[PDB]
Amino acid sequence: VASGSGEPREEAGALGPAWDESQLRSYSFPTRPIPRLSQSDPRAEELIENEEPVVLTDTNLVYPALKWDLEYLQENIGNGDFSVYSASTHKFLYYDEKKMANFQNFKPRSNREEMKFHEFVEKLQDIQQRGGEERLYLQQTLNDTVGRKIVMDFLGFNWNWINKQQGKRGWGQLTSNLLLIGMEGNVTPAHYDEQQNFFAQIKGYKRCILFPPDQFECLYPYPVHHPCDRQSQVDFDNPDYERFPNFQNVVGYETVVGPGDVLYIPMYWWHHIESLLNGGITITVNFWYKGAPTPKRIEYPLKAHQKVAIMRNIEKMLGEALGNPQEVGPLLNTMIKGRYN
Amino acid sequence: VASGSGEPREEAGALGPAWDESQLRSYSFPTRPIPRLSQSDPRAEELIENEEPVVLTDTNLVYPALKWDLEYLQENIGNGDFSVYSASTHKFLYYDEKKMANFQNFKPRSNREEMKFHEFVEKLQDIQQRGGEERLYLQQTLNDTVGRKIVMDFLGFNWNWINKQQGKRGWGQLTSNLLLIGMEGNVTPAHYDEQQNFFAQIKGYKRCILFPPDQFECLYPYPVHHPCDRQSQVDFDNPDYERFPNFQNVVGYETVVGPGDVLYIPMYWWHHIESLLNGGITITVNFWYKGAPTPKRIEYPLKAHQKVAIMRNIEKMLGEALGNPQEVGPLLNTMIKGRYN
């Protein structure tokens, strides 16, 4: 049952296997595969309503974007500035800058930098030709400054379908569309987002390792006031079982998305994402939606994400009441030490 | 500086020392003495405003009650029912009955029982003559059903003085007057009350061991939803340093109150109270006042009792939100384990 992401899919026109195992990094934990279904399959709709991951193989959600690539985008993506993170390692740990205040002892592993698409493509072309070890990752929201063709393509997305999803799930509004363009091998460490996400793969292959909300005690997120809030403190490449013992009870659902696939990442679900090794650059556009609002009377017992919501709020409250985020830990410890533990 | 409660006071008329060391139980912790001052002494007023313990030797607060004793009280205290706790050991751990629901695995060490004063005096006279090991402790609020003379004596209390205290400290209303009549040797284990208290000694001698609010982590109170809420889990006679390590850093302020003394027990201050061994029965009447309300803008950093107030509230919140008090510990542990500890 630990098939992983399943056997490599066979490409149409006998073009060989899309990717192969050796492109996947190795980890200490087991994973079961995420269902790869058809948007017309009743099961998929079932999984989405039940807030469980699922790869939809035929939405045509971002059909017009499947022709995107560096040249095309550079050709007409606009003149605006694109946020670009650089890093020494293959892990791009996201950090909230507005929170960097609280922890003056945090050394960023990845640094951001604004630039023009053509600049990213160059910096990317240089390392690419000079064989540098440096890595880049473009993560920018799609604004107004967008090119004419890109705005055209954007209109070609399957809004009929996605909008109905927003309606059936009672979700809130579409908060944004993030454009991600990464280099083969790049990794986004495990974290959970507070919104519903439709992850539409465009170019290259990405391995997605998700974990359910109820595995909060195995993933050890950073403190809410820390810059790395919502990220796992556990280093998947070298898990510290002394500090993070329950990480040995972790079980994730995995899959490899390719051009045309849309992975539903339910709100609060942890996800670890990597661009296959030697798989070339990757392109993905995600859609973020505020989740549906809290029901009239909250039934019992609570769902795992509700508890996570509570914990998060308790930490924020103590942060304000105490007048200083760093006294949160001490107060919490004083509260349980010898009383609840 | 660990004088304890100081050297035994010499009684007027060369009637020898009021009490002696051998009447005091022995404990593993050190104590410094609580100032014994005059109500006219500026220092006392200073200590009260600063919310620090102090024994006031001359208030005449309960002057008329100094003539009380079993016969007198029985003679005219009324026909109402008096709450009476019985127990095998010398420790009368207070338990909140309304909370006994939450912990169906709690075995009461002391059992309550309503009865007529004359009944308490009898049950007390029997054990007293049959040399029983059983112990009793009368703890009853002074109601309306009070006798005529008792109501007279009550009027003789020094309201002028105490009322001014309530006014100077901005305290709230007098919530009640508890009448406590115990047997020599009886002990009330360390706990903290949420109100300002003026502890007026009437008959016999009581040793009072107080601890400041900031020693919360050394006294390990029971969970807020537990019946023994606000009591220390540490057994002073046999302290479990494995479960309660910080109990080895505990330092209390001590004193022995006698007829006529009034001990100010500041709100949230822990107190351990014992009737001297072979010292006869003890009588005390306390006065409970709601503390002053929270100031306009709360300055920083917070005072220790404010933090204790916060912790208490956090526990109550999780108790309601989770829909069940017993899930509080687990949620709290899941919150800090590997994140804040």
């Binding site: 908060t175 507070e194 919104q195 996400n197 809030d229 973020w288 909250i298 509700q306 919501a309 709020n313 | -």
Partner: peptide, 13 residues
């Protein structure tokens, strides 16, 4: 309460 279990809307952006 229940003003407790409500969430926010933070994503890695």
């Amino acid at each position: 309460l229940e003003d407790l279990i409500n969430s926010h809307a933070d994503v890695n952006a």
